[model samples]
Target: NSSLPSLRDVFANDFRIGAAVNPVTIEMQKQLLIDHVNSITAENHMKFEHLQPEEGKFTFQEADRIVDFACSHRMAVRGHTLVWHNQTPDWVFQDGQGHFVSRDVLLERMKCHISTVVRRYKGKIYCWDVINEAVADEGDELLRPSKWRQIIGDDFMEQAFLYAYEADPDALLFYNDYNECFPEKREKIFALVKSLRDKGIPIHGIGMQAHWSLTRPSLDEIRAAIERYASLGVVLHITELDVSMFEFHDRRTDLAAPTSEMIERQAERYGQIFALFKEYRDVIQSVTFWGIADDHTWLDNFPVHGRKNWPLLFDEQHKPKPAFWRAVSV
Candidate 1:
């Protein structure tokens, strides 16, 4: 049997140790959660497409299982999203007559969805990723040119947060994005959220989807990001952590398995990352690995297909990697 200090306990006063979950992780790595972490985020069950797939019809089989597991275990839950550019059904943007809905119509639909999802699990969920990846990638444009923005305008982001606040004022609402540590995105997201706060919106947190590799996003870059966001006077969350073994967008077919040197490199990086994370414990509310372990990571079947990644703290056989101990010892 596996034995180690509870990751959650070791960081008891620092911040929450969390993991993203799905049916696979829930059933297979069930005890891994009980032993290692205290917070859980539904990987996709609570998104727009999954929850209200056909509009007005709600699906809760998977979502309920996730929240119920958290309820039984006394774990904190984070509602992964009320709105996002991707994963939302196309029908939500179009009218029954096969035309794009007007601004007001789209806004109403959003309000209804947010209200229903947030209200259903009001007390059970501790926070909500009210909006995700809404900022544009480059240039003077602030918001992404998604259908939500095309129809509802820049105000759509604030409106979502406002509606979520009404649904459950206590639930911490956050704006989540990938690559938040990069200087360009860091400043862009910083400017966007700064505007939201200035307008008196109840935007509570900044969700950094920290999918890092061993060499990229060096310690100084990570430190700068935390310091920049912490100065925003809001809660900071390491929402998704997948320390990938390879760089982005390499489609090479033949790949070598991780060598001892590679594993040790990852271990050292994870430990260094956590030690830096400890420095921002005041503003950093929680830190969650994207999944429980390597066996079930999205990296395996991701669109950027290439080599299989052993990026997480647990191996395919459910054995803890040196990376796990590295992070723990931090």
Candidate 2:
């Protein structure tokens, strides 16, 4: 029998707050994230590059460290991205002579990579963004201009799902991407996903990377996307969620002085998002914040510094911000 509690409730029950994992050297960041988060996403930047970089010189040192942390904290793990185009090593595509590898070679590499990684963490990982950013924002059938696409053609995404399914039949595999809330993109994705479901693909879930804005989050559009996917009887996760309010340049100009309107807007934005979660809690499985603490958010360095990007639920000191409480309140 399926559970009755909402996905957010289930996700929040054990490990609610989470962070993008770096090494243990980022202990401060980890603690900050752990304080507010119930799960952690292992970046595995080096681990991924090392694995399959030169056709079998695989390493899981970084991923192991991250798993160690998650186990120690009893936090669930969301295997971020098995088959992404970026962050992958160039050697994946290039031959010894520096030319593009043959299609068969690339496909073999993908299958091997998926089988090895997913098989290792088979039952340990709760959810996986099996195929990340494979489609364009417009949800075109063609593959995004990624290295995987360059060799594998438009069927890159389908192949990825097949490989992931073959590797771990029990793990929940999700199609993860940004801007899925938009109507045009959502429709196309829903169409494609419906076909996969009809064909009995092992796609068990969908992850909407809710990187949203303060005033214009397009909640209706997001709702539509969720309902569309949910109607197909698959889990929906609000993965990598964060709402930014750096548009207000003045820190002193609080909507209510010295409080920073950005903070006020952030709190309100969080409430709105959580309200949606409450409304559509049935199909949604998890709401993992991109970064638990403000200080550790990629938004800090993203799009330049000194911009004052406050997109998290907690401050640098691991203190829950108004936004965090607001989300909990919802």
Candidate 3:
């Protein structure tokens, strides 16, 4: 191991420094990920869509590779998701006729899928995002209008947690979602989490997907959200963190490369966030960047499709950027 001041070392007494990684990253950025991040979450390999692309015909080649990489590196693995709305195959909620299956059938399938995935990874994965994005964007009723909810109702969330816990009672289970800092959504999610806990569900943490921009959702707002979630006495994980340099509406396909000024601003923003994470170290268990490098960031195709966005601490060439130094400074 290089005797460098790694991110894991910087936060050794605080929390784990983590990254979302894929198979290619395991080969291309292996040393970089090992030197910096102490934990790894599968970028897309562990998602339900990829795991069980065809019903009852689960694939484990890619996900297994990721888990093995983490194990060999002595890094903690956080399973990306067992249940999620996006990236899920229609076959999961539909029967042979492309029609929604009965509630009993859906629940049976959910149980089988969760049991199989969680059982395989039992003690290997330290945490699992049992259910993801269950809350609606704008509504008094917190639950989203997913087929999971539409067919199985809000009970799906609770059942998912129960099933995961049954499969691996030792693994930490989390409810992962994006836009977790918004006031309305936060309130709704808080209620859902609180209810789950009250019902004795094994919901251990809340995954805040900090898919931020340079200026939106001020640091104070983010901090407040952290504090609010921490109040529930469960762990808080910044599961998918990335600060985009471009505005959400700037859909320009030919935008110039990130300038030095933009990089500096991104660095400062990342520094501020890391500082806050340090302040809440007791409650925050891990801070995982969405990707290891700008070149592989999901932001390149999200929000405004086809827009190249710089959002990670590393540049395209696998070299640490100013943001990396800033984050490690904490």
Candidate 4:
């Protein structure tokens, strides 16, 4: 512990250092997680699909393990989500005939799910991504037409924040989404948060899933986005951060291993990002990497399946890469 500067300690005065953890990382990289991070979020165990695969019946075994681990280690926990468009069971929106249920029925079911999950971990979890990816990717309509919106309407997001607050007023509630760095998405999300707050919804934060590359979304753009959200009087969180070394358009060649020059470039980029995060430490509550190490990052199969990607601070060997030290310096 004394040999290296732990990331938690380095950012102790600024914000929490967090990592997304799964069962595999929990066992194999326990020491790294314990030593570096002071906050933990379950990667997928707490999602609706995993928590309640069936209607009315709940499964808490894996999620319990994660929460308990965080508690034992004196680390703060952030619930991955209570509602999302993906990874949810179809039964939630369908009846025995496989047809969409009435709005009233869907609302009732949503209440049950939100209340059950939120109440169970009321005090233990500090923050919850209450609504995730509700906004459209690219369209005239701002809200995404998921089953929740299609049946229950956009008010479903408002109701979610209200229900979560009712269950645990002390917990911080956040609306999380990717592509938030883009101007169009950022403005819409900011507007949505403002509307919710004006209507007395207890939304406390906005999660910018910083799934970035080395060059795209320049530092100024990222800083501007953060400032814009912070102006809304809510905490700004870099919820899912990772800097992929590969370019999206040029995926023709796969490098056998990252070159020394490649590693140094990543370190410089990470340093720049962290410095910016530290600049807004007054409003940012936590900065969490999407995964603990490169080996298990979702980027491996994302966008293009089976394509290997190096996107996290630690390499496959669980050793701190140059990026880790660079971040610590900030």
Cα lDDT tens digits for candidate 1, 53-132: 99899997899999999889989999998889999999999998999999999999999999999999999998999999
Leading candidate by lDDT: 1
Expressed as tens digits, the lDDT of each residue in 1-330 for candidate 3 is: 344568888899988888998899778887789788889999999999889999889999999999998899889999989888899998988888989998889999999999999899987898999988888877677777888888887798889999998999899899999889888888888989999999998999999999888987788889879989999988999999999987766667787698888899999999999999999998998989898887788888887777788899888887788888888887
Listed in order, each prediction's TM-score against the native is 0.97, 0.86, 0.96, 0.97
TM-score of 2: 0.86
Off by over 4 Å in 3: 1-4
Q: Flag regions of model 1 displaced more than 4 Å.
A: 138-140
Residue-level lDDT of model 2, residues 1-330, one tens digit each, is: 122222234346432445666775347675454444567777554345755566688777777777778778777788878788777888888889999998889898889888898888877777778788776664345346788888977677778888988888878889888778777777766777777788877888888888787765477777778888798898888888888664434343323211467688788878888888877766775778776666666765555554456677767665677786677776
Residues 1-330, candidate 4: write the lDDT tens digits: 358788888999999989999777799889889898889999999999999899978999899999988899999998989889999999999989999998899888888998999899988999999999998889867888799888887799988888888888999999999888888888888888889998988999999889888886789889989999999899888898989877667574466677787789899999999999999999998999998788788988787678778888888987889998998897
Q: Which candidate would rank higher by TM-score, 1 or 3?
A: 1
- TM-score of candidate 3 on Cα atoms, chains taken together: 0.96
* Model 1, residue pairs in steric clash: none
lDDT of 1: 0.89
